[PDB]
Amino acid sequence: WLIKEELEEMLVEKLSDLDYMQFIRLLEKLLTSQCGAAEEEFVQRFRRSVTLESKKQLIEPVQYDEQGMAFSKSEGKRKTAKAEAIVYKHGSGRIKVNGIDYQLYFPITQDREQLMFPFHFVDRLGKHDVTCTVSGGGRSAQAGAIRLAMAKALCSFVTEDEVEWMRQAGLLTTDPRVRE
């Protein structure tokens, strides 16, 4: 419904709150009745389109490499670490970080668990190959940025319900917490 001061702007006259409520009540009464096209347009003159906004997690498109394999690329950032991951549709669960195996690149088990989180959450461990590149930051920031990039790239190969579940699990949100 139109706000009071916008209704004032259009009517070019100051009006109180009670008379605004009276006008809105009349408009609601008009809507309740079988309003025709003219009446629908008249009410639409007073109806603004702001309400409601849907968080749907724009999916990345599927690219195809020279060998004919399907892959999707995505980016992520955590503190000063920036990562870009390429997730292939089919694989055996091989993750390569800067050309290095993930267990060699990430000695600490916490980082490996963070990298495991996206694929485990959707029960497709051992079904995709990842080739990522991370720069800047430290150990944990790099692990988190890779986690985010992999989740966003993986969103291409799951159902929309699984995309929304990943979003509700925090797997698709950029962590904005940074030093002062």
Partner: protein
């Protein structure tokens, strides 16, 4: 007792090992007086190289962490100067047994970055760990690659641990537990064993 020395070894003006005495006496001399322990190792090697060539016995030289011999040390003199690996008698006598100037045996060696000196954590190939000197010394040699578990090996390792009741978490027997263990170790034997240690 069967193996018998072939030279008179003089430990001190008072003590010497006579020709033909069993090698055990030499070994015993190293265990009683530590002052002669290092000289006792070398003698043993000198005998074991020689008699093996005659054909008295077959000799296996099994040296783990062999990349130490041609590397650097962290041992210092009293004037805080470095010591080279070849300045150590024990290391200098063990290099002679890596040379293929003898028959009647085989030399088996294993590299190891763990416990190495002045090597990055991700160095594992022969030349990187050996150095130019080490690679030149061992060359020619047969390198044998050891890799992570394959799926059959990994499943067998977890079944051995389950048969020993060593995996006590309720989810480890299940398929999801095995998939998570596989991801978290990447089929690496040491990481898998360490993870299973506290499960």
């Amino acid at each position: 007792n069967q193996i018998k020395v072939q030279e008179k070894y003089v430990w001190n003006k008072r003590e010497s090992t006579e020709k033909g005495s069993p090698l055990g006496e030499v070994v015993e001399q190293g265990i009683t007086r530590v002052r002669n322990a290092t000289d006792a190792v070398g003698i043993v090697l000198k005998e074991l190289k020689r008699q093996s060539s005659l054909g008295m016995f077959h000799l296996l030289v099994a040296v783990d962490g062999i990349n130490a011999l041609w590397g650097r040390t962290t041992l210092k003199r009293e004037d805080k100067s470095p010591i080279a690996p070849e300045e150590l008698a024990l290391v200098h006598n063990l290099r002679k047994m890596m040379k293929n100037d003898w028959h009647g045996g085989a030399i088996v060696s294993a590299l190891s970055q763990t416990g190495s000196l002045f090597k990055p954590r991700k160095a594992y190939l022969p030349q990187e760990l050996l150095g130019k000197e080490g690679f030149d010394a061992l060359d020619p040699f047969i390198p044998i690659l050891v890799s992570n578990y394959n799926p059959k090996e990994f499943e067998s390792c977890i079944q051995y641990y389950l048969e020993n009741n060593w995996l006590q978490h309720e989810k480890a027997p299940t398929e999801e537990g095995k998939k998570e263990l596989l991801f978290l170790s990447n089929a690496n034997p040491s990481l898998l064993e360490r993870h299973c240690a506290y499960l």
